[PDB]
């Protein structure tokens, strides 16, 4: 608005290589850390899994459906076996998943 | 005298070499040593410009540098304050720990019998003759 301006008050006083034809879709690979891995589970099934109402079933998570290609290992995981299907994985993330009791499966 | 970093020193340029001194401001100044050389020393001096202090650094030969006694009185006073406080706690009597400014003199009487005053003129008559 013009009426709030200061000029109304001042009225009367005046490296590296070059990549030709780059395609970002080649290097598209979004990543998620393992402390947000349980957030991809739907909330109510996540609550039964965390409470301990499912002693005979394990969840399978597909990261490509949620929009992620690499599973990274920031944070910690509970002692629940989780099957993870990811395009990429880091070594310590896979170690923490196996310590939790699940398995990391590679998909394309 | 082997000077060390952090020692507080006084600067006195001895001799009548004042014909061509570049900086006579630091003569008689006190500063802190930051660098030591075999015949030189680095002195931090503070100058006052109006309301603020500016920091200057000089290189002075050892022949014009003497150790300062600025904190000698403070360390000494700390020592007898501790010792007389221990003595006061031993004997159970209060004692003064604070130095005080000079107080005005009290009333007193001056005898005249052997000290008769001499009358003086604005000039001496022995000088008049």
């Amino acid at each position: 608005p013009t009426r709030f301006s200061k000029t109304r008050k001042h009225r009367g006083h005046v490296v590296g290589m070059r990549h030709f034809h780059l395609l970002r879709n080649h290097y598209w690979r979004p990543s998620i850390n393992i402390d947000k891995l349980w957030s991809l589970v739907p909330s109510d099934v996540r609550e039964q899994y965390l409470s301990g109402q499912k002693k005979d079933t394990a969840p399978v998570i597909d990261l490509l459906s949620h929009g992620y290609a690499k599973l990274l290992g920031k944070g910690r995981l509970p002692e629940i076996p989780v099957v993870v299907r990811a395009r990429y994985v880091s070594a310590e993330a896979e170690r923490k998943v196996k310590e939790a009791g699940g398995v990391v499966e590679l998909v394309a | 005298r082997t000077y060390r970093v952090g020692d507080i020193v006084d600067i006195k340029v001895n001799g009548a070499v004042q014909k061509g001194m570049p900086h006579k401001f630091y003569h008689g100044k006190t500063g802190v040593v930051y660098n030591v050389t075999k015949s030189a020393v680095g002195v931090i001096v503070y100058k006052r410009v109006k309301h603020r202090y500016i920091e200057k650094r000089i290189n002075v030969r050892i022949e014009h540098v003497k150790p300062s006694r600025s904190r000698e009185d403070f360390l000494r006073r700390v020592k007898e304050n501790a010792e007389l406080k221990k003595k006061a706690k031993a004997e159970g009597v209060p004692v003064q720990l604070k130095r005080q400014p000079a107080m005005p003199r009290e009333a007193h009487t001056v005898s005249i019998a052997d000290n008769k005053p001499v009358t003086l003129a604005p000039v001496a008559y022995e000088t008049t003759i």
Partner: protein
């Protein structure tokens, strides 16, 4: 009431004591040198224009910021040197009991919580100086005149 009676008696006795000591020395053939003054009243009589920074700072520390302002100063060397430096702006001297009581009775204002409150009651002096034993204006006058511990 009793304390004011004691103070009046003490003033009379100290005056007669000084007179008696002077007379005794004169009769014995000597001179009694009186004690140097312990209290100085200082009045700023020159303005705030064209003043060097050191006298400016000394007048600030002596609380003489306006012309015709007066303060009481206990005589030490540390204050005597300051007053000697700010001599070209002040007039100072040794006040007597009448000067002290006139100043405190007529122009007596206390600093209470950073405010300038007139001394209209003994109560203000009592809650502002009762921890030092000064409970009324007569104690205040006695302390200022005799230069007590407070």
């Amino acid at each position: 009431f009793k304390r004011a009676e004691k103070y009046v008696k003490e003033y009379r006795e100290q005056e007669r004591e000084k007179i008696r000591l002077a007379r005794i020395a004169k009769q014995q053939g000597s001179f009694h040198i009186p004690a140097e003054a312990k209290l100085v009243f200082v009045i700023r009589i020159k303005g705030i224009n064209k003043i060097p920074p050191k006298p400016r700072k000394i007048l600030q520390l002596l609380r003489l910021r306006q012309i015709n302002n007066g303060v009481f100063v206990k005589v030490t060397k540390a204050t005597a040197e300051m007053i000697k430096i700010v001599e070209p702006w002040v007039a100072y001297g040794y006040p007597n009991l009448k000067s002290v009581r006139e100043l405190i009775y007529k122009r007596g204002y206390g600093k209470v919580n950073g405010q300038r409150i007139p001394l209209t009651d003994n109560a203000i002096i009592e809650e502002n100086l009762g921890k030092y034993g000064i409970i009324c204006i007569e104690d205040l006058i006695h302390e200022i005149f005799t230069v007590g511990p407070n």
